[PDB]
mmCIF file of C-alpha atoms and ligand atoms in Angstrom:
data_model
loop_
_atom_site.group_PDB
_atom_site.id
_atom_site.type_symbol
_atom_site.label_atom_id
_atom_site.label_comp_id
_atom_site.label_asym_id
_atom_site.label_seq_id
_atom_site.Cartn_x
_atom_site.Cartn_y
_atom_site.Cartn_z
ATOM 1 C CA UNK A 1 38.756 82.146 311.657
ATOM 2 C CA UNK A 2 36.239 84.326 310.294
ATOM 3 C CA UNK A 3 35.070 82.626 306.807
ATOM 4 C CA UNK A 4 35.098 84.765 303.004
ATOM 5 C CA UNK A 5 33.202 84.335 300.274
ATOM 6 C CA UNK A 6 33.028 85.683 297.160
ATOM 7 C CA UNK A 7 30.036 86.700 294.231
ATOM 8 C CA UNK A 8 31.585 87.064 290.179
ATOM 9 C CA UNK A 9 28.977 89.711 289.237
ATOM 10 C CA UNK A 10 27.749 89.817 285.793
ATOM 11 C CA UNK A 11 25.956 92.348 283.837
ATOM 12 C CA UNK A 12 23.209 91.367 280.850
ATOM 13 C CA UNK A 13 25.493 88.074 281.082
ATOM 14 C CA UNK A 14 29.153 89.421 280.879
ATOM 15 C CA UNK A 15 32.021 90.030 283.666
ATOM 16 C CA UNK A 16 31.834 92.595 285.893
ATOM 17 C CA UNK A 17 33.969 91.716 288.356
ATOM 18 C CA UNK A 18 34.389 90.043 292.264
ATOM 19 C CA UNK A 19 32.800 91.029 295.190
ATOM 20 C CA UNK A 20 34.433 89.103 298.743
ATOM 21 C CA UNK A 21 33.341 89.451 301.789
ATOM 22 C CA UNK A 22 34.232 88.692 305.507
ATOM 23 C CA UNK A 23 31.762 86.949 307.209
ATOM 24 C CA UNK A 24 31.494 87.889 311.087
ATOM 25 C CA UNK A 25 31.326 84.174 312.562
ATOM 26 C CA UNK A 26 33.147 85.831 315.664
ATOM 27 C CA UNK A 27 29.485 87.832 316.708
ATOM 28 C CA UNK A 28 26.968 86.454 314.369
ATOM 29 C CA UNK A 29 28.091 82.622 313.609
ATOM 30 C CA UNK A 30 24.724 81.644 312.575
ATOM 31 C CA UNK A 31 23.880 84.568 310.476
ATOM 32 C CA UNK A 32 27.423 83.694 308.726
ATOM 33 C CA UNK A 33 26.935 80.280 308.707
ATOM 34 C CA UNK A 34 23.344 80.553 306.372
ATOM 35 C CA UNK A 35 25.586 83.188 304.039
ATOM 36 C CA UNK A 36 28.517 81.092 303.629
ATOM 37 C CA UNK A 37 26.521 77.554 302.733
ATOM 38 C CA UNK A 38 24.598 79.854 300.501
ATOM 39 C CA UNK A 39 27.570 81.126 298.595
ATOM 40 C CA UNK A 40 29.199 77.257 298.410
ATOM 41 C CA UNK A 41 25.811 75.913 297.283
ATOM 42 C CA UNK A 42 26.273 72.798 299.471
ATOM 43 C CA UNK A 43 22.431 72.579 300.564
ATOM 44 C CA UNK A 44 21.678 72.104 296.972
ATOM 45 C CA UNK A 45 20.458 75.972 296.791
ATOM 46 C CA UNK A 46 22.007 78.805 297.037
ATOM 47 C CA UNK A 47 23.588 82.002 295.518
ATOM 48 C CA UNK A 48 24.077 81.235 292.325
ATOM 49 C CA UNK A 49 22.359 82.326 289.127
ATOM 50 C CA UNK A 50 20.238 85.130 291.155
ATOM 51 C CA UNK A 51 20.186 88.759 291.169
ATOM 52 C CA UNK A 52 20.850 92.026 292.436
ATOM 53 C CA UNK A 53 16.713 92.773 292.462
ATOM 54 C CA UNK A 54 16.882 96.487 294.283
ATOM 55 C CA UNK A 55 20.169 98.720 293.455
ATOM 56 C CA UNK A 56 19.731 102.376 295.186
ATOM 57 C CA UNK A 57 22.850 104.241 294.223
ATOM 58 C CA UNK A 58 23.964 106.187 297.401
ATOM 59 C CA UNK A 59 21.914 103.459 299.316
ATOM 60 C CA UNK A 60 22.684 99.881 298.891
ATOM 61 C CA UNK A 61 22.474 96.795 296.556
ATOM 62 C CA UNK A 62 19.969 93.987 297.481
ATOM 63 C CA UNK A 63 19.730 90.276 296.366
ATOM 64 C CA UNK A 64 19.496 87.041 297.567
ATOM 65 C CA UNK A 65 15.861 85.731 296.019
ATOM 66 C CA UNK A 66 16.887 81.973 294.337
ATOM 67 C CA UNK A 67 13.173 80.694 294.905
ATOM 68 C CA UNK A 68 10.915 82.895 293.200
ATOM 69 C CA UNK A 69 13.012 85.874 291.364
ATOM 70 C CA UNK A 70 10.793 88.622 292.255
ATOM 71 C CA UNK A 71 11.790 89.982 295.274
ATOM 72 C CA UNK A 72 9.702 88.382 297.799
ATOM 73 C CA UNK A 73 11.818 84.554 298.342
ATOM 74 C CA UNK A 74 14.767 83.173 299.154
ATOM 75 C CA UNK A 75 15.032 80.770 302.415
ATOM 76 C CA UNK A 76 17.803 80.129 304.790
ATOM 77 C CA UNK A 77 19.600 77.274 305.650
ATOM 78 C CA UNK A 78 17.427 76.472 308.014
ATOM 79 C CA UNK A 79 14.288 75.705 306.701
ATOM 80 C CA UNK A 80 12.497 78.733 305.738
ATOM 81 C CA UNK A 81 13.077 81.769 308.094
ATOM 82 C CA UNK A 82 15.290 82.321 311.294
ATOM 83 C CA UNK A 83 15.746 84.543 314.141
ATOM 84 C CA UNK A 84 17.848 88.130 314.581
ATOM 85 C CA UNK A 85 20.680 86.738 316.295
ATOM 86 C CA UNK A 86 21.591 90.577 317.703
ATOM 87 C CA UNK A 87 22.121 93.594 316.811
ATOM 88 C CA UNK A 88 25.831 94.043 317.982
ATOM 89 C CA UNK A 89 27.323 95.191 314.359
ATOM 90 C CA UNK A 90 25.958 98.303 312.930
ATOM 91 C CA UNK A 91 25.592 99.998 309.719
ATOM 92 C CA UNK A 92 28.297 102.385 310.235
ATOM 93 C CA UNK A 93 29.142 102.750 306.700
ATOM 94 C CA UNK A 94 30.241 101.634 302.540
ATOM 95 C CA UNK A 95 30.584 97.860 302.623
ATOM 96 C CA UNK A 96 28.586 96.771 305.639
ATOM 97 C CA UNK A 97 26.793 93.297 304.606
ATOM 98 C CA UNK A 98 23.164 92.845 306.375
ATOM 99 C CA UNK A 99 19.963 90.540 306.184
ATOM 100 C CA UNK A 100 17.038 92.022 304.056
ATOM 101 C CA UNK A 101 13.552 91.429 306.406
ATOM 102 C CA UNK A 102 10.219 91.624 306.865
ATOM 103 C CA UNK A 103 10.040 92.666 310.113
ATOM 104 C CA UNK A 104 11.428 91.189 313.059
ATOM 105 C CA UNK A 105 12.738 87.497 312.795
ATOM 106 C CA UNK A 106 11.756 86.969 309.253
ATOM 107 C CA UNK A 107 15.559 86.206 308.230
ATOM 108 C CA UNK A 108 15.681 83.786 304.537
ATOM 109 C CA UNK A 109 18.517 84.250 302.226
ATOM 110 C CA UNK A 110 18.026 88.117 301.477
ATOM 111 C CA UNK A 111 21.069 90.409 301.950
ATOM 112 C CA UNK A 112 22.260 93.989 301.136
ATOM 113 C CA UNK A 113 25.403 95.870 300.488
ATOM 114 C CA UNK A 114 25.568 99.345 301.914
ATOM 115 C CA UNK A 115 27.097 101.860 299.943
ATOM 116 C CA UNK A 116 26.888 104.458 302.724
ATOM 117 C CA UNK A 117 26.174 104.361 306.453
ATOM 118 C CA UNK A 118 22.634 103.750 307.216
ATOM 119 C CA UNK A 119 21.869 104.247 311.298
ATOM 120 C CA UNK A 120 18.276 104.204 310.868
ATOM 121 C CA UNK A 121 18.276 100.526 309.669
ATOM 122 C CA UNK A 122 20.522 99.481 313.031
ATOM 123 C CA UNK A 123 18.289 97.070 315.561
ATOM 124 C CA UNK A 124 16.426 96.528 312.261
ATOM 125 C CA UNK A 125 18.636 94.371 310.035
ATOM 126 C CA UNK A 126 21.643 92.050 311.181
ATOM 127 C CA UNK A 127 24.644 93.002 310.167
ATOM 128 C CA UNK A 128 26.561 90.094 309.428
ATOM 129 C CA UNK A 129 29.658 90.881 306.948
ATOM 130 C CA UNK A 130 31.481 93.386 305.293
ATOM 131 C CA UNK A 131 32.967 93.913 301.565
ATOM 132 C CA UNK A 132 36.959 92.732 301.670
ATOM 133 C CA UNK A 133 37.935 93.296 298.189
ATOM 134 C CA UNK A 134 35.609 94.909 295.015
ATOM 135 C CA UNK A 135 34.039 97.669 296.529
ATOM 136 C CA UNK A 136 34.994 99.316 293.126
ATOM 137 C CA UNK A 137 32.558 96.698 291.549
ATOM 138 C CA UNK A 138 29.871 97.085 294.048
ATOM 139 C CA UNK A 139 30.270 101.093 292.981
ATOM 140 C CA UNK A 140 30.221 100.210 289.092
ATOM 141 C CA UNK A 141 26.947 98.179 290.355
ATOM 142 C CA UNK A 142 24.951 101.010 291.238
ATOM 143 C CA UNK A 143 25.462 103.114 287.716
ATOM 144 C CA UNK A 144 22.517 100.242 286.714
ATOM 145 C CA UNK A 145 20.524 101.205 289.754
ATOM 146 C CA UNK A 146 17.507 104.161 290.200
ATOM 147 C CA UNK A 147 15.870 105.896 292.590
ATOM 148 C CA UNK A 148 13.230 103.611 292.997
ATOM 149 C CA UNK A 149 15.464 100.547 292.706
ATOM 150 C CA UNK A 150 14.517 98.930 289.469
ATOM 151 C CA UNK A 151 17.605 97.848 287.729
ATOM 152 C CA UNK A 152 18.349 98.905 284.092
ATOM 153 C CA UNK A 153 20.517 95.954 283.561
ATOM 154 C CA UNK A 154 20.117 92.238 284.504
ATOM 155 C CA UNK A 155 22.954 92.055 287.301
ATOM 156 C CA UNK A 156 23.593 88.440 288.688
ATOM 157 C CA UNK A 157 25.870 86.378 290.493
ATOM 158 C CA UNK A 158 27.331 84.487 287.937
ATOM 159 C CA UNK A 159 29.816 82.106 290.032
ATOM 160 C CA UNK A 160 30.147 82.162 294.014
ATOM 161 C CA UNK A 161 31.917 80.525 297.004
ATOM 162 C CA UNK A 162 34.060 80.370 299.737
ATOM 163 C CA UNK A 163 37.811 81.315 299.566
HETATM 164 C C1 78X B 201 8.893 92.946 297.282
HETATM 165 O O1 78X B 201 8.664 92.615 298.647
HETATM 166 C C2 78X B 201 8.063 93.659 299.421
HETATM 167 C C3 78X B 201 9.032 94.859 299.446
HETATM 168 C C4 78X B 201 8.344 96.225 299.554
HETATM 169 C C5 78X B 201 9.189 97.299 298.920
HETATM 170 C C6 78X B 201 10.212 97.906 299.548
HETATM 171 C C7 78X B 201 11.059 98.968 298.973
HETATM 172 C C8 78X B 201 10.853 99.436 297.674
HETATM 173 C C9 78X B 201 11.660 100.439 297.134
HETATM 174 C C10 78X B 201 12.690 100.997 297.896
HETATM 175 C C11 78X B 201 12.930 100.546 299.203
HETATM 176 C C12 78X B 201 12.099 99.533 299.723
HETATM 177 C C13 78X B 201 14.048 101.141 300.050
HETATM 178 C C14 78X B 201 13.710 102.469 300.731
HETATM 179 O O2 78X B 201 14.414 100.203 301.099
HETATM 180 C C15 78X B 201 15.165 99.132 300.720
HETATM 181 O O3 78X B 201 15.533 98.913 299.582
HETATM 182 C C16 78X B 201 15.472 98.255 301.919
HETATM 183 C C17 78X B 201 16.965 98.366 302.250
HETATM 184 C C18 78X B 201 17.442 97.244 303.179
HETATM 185 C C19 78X B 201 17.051 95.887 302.601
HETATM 186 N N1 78X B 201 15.598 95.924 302.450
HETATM 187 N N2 78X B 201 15.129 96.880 301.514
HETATM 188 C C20 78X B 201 14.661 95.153 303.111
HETATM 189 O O4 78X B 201 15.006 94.308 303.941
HETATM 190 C C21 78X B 201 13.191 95.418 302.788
HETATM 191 C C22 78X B 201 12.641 96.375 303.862
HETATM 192 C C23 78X B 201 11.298 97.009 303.569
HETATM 193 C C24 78X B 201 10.149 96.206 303.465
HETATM 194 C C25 78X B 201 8.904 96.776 303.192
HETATM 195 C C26 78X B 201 8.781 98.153 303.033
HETATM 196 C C27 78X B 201 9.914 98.949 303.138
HETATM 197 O O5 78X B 201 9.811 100.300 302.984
HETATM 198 C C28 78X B 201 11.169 98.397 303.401
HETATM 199 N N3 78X B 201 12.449 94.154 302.785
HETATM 200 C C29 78X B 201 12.253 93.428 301.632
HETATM 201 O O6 78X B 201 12.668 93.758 300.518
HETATM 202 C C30 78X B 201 11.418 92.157 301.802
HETATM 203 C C31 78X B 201 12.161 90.890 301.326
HETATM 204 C C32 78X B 201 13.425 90.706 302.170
HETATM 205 C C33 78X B 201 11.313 89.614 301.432
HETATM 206 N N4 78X B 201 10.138 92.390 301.128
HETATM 207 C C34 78X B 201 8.994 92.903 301.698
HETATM 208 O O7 78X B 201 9.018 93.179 302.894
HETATM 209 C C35 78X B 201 7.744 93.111 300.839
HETATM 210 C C36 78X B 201 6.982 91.783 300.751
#
């Protein structure tokens, strides 16, 4: 019952390839639920056209920001922020699928990939999802990451949605 989606990732504007994801409805269903409508675009907002703003190879990709492209926006379904539902799921390794933050409860649209386990950000970040097919593209991804996170190529989602 657990819902996937999926991102077409583009580089400078051509195909990389498809990231999907399941989404853990079973422990986090509202977490899920903001991820999902934001793949489908059904709010009228939404995935779609954004980037990959912060790619740390040997870390993780981040993305999400469709208000204000510079790292900082993105909202939920919700109306602007929600709650950490728990902290059940952890970080336990390449693929896990979590909400970017400010701090506690400050939950929009943001969202990383992990490309390695990352304890130290469990009871930080929700962990919501993991990578079901294209973890070879999320890999590709990071060759246009750096250490600081700055991306040397424009990487977007091109096309998303729910399978
Ligand atoms: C632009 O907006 C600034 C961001 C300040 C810059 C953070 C920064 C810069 C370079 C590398 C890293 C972090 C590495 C080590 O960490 C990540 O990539 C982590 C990995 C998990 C996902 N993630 N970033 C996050 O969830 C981060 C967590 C965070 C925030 C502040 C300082 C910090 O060291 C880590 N939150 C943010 O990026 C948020 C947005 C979600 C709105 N922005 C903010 O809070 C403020 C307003």
């Amino acid at each position: 019952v657990n819902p996937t989606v999926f991102f077409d990732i583009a580089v400078d504007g051509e195909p990389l390839g498809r990231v999907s994801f399941e989404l853990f409805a079973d422990k986090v269903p509202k977490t899920a639920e903001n991820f999902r409508a934001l793949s489908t675009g059904e709010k009228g907002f939404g995935y779609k056209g954004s980037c990959f703003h912060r790619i740390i190879p040997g870390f993780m990709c981040q993305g999400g920001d469709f208000t204000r492209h510079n790292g900082t926006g993105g909202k939920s379904i919700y109306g602007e922020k929600f709650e950490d539902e728990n902290f059940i799921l952890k970080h336990t390794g390449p693929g896990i699928l979590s909400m970017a933050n400010a701090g506690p409860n400050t939950n929009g649209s943001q969202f990383f990939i992990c490309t390695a386990k990352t304890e130290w950000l469990d009871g930080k970040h929700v962990v919501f999802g993991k990578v079901k097919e294209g973890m070879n593209i999320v890999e590709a991804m990071e060759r246009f990451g750096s250490r600081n996170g700055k991306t040397s190529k424009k990487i977007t989602i091109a096309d998303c949605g729910q399978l």
